[PDB]
């Protein structure tokens, strides 16, 4: 429309209907100029990369993108508490995105003094990739998200992708995507962008624990009509052999028969938060569970969802099998254990095996009069018909969704890190501010113009998601566990701003408090 | 609409209809940037605060708000005179607010020389809190009001609130309100804001005195048919005892019976404006009436409305029980008594007890042949069925309304300072100019952008209130007292501008001149 | 509960346009007298003016759950707040709803001003303090005065050159126009309703 009329209002509210939530958010963003309007073929050989497992090849683009898919973007700590205390499950339904109130600024730096001026005729060009024709970055949980606190202004991250490689070289199947080669919408100040998206049907994330375990499904009062082999030995002494059977019953459980078995396991190494209980050596990389693909060992981060520890022992956690979050202002490298936030998976102890323990035990050999019965340990168990498991839990800081890779087959395509796997997730929104060149020379030259005006843009994003809720039907008598702010006095308020104006989330908040029967 | 078309006209008039007044006002405001776009967790421990009664904890916000609720904002001294001389009572009906002709300016300070330039694309974002979901600051009588003189340009005050604390620490029930978390309207130059509000039914403020006191309600010509105990002593000497009764009549009043009694009292200390009559000591804090809440002694400012002094003695005033206003250009601290404006409450002498005197006297003990009758003093009297009082008077400089706290119960929720108490007062209008960041760095960074453009905005506010009037019906013969400008010559005109261009109100103007029968 | 107290209703950033009497003494020494005034502001709160005041109070005796901190005597009946009706002293159980304790001190509770529940299988008489369930009223600290503390302080006399300013304690305060309070809290074990006696008048007939 025009320069003096606003493109859109700030709408941050969230409305709770019965079966449905609609959470609107609005932020202020700032978009710089990336790579000086170039595509630079990034590879490991540019800097270091002396290990084959770290080899990569790809391209960096001047474009930048919006990643809103962490949970803290769309939920306040109170709207999250209201969510997870009152509801068994949820899932997204619709998505609506808006760009408005765009402003483009010119910067002139001369004699070290710099003047920022406003370009009314400049454009910024933005498109959504609806057909998934570009490498999908978002589902990888990289930084650059809408800040959790609505008053922050955030930079838009740079877009770039990786392709096939042999070492640092490019293999003939490598693809190159020119992002200028897509239809986009060019926006001046007084233009606004929007689009709508409908999530494909995804199973409700289950926010509950289980009020009974998998190995106790039974009436403790009554016997089973099925037997087991209780006694293989008549008595002590030679040639004493007999087969005695016994009714499996409350006196001896864990020998009863049962219809279902716990989920699969891939063992992780156990490491204790107490320092002295750990070994003295470097076991971090060497002693870690990995998966190798095409000669590259990819360390196995968050794998099959598994209970992090057993019973009341919290001292230890799986090496790579847990999510680790940083606190506010946490360093980049060699951070002490107190500044990281380690996540606790113990809610699934009922249906899932412990991550650091063997799935079970199997017989190695056939016994005979000569040969003793020998049993080995099962470190990993892929699946068995009749297994039952649960997915890894959802947090405020964790990703909302991921993209299920397009492939011939996949089993239970729920993201190993967390969230809602989708064949067609909400599309990427890429944004770039169009180049404005400096004065061309008078005489014509074949070469392309490498001199541009230093420039950046600013605006607001509105992202509203419509969520579908599954209400608690529980007939339980005694009171539930809920998520609370502990009342004791403190220098600061949790999930509130600091004295310097810094917003910090004290602890990771899981989704699982309410319980259901197994 | 557009840059070159004005958003609204200046409308300052006031129209007097028969039963109704409509007072429009228009001012020019200037809105700076507060806290560098931050929320800073203000507390007593930041500076000083070595006394527990002064302990506080809260948050300061970049937002700012419009406080128009003093009376001098909406009334000229002539429209106030016309009001209080001709009318018994009044109360607000409707409210209408407008923001228009917004202008946003960029400031660049380099080498000490600074250039203010105009940003046509910048926005300012403003919302009214209709649901009272934010701490309500306005009713506390803090500075920052629309100036009394229409030609002044005024700064908008910063918004901030307090929450629970233990000392300077935050208690777990403390709340944090992000103001960005509310839907707001974003305005460029060429946009205008408005809303309407209807005052809930409030009793008319009574602007009148009483033409007869509470203890003289009676026919002075006629006797009462009720007796009293006139004489308990037969005569002087031993064993002389009798009960003699007498008709209560004009000869001996103040012993008659009567249907109603004066309002409640909480005694204040008496201090004289004459210096030598006061004691030599510091009695200010120690000798002052206070009320303690949760271990904190809150000094009792304006309490139950009570006559400030008795009869023709104006030398003294209650310590904390009176409103004190400053004159124009009055200092902040340790101001002499001549520069402050002390308010005179004596109009209520009829229905209310004197603030510095006991409510009455009560018997302490049972008399007998041995025991003499002993009576103690009533310093405070809460209520009795049959009490009658009046509220504290309204001024030009005093607040128009307040917010009745939401609670299980309240008695006679009329503000102790003055004005119209309301469960749902006219909502707060908060305003902020949206951040425009300086040039982002080229390489992406996780941190939020702390560098912004120095900026401020300007515009005009129109606030019109519709008032309901209660006309004088008086059948009095002799002439009333009215409010006048004394005719004698002076260097300046009262309620007029100085030689330097300074507007000054000489004296506080009560609302009570006309009289009614008790 | 309330997320802000009654004595902090204010903008901590901004001053008040109303003054108070800051200094009654010019300096030390004889014949030094003056009236100095000061803007009530964030630096000195609790001296600011404010539109509303806390609810009424009828003082209760303070008794500590810690044994040794209590006095050695029988103060149970003698030292207890009561109300007399027609020559009968009716001990005052749950009276005006008032904060049971102040700040972070839970050691003590009002003698008769709190609800006491028994645990399961609790004896009838002379039950130890551990088997009873004592109720905690501290949620109302914001709008209500502490049950065991005075409502405030009032001046006793008129000052003069000869007479010093003297102030007495308010043990009970009935009501004042402008008071604000809250009712006593509801529990699982507590009663749902009551019957308002049929009478000419009643004030705030909440049980």
From TrEMBL, chain C:
Q: Where does beta-D-galactose bind?
A: 44, 77
Residues engaged in binding Ca(2+) 2: 139
Please give the superkingdom of this protein's source: Viruses
Which positions are annotated as binding Ca(2+) 1? 136, 139
The places in or outside the cell where this protein is found are: Virion
Q: Per the similarity annotation, which family is this?
A: Belongs to the parvoviridae capsid protein family.
Descriptive protein name: Capsid protein VP1
Query: Intact protein stretch covered?
Result: 427 to 633 of 736
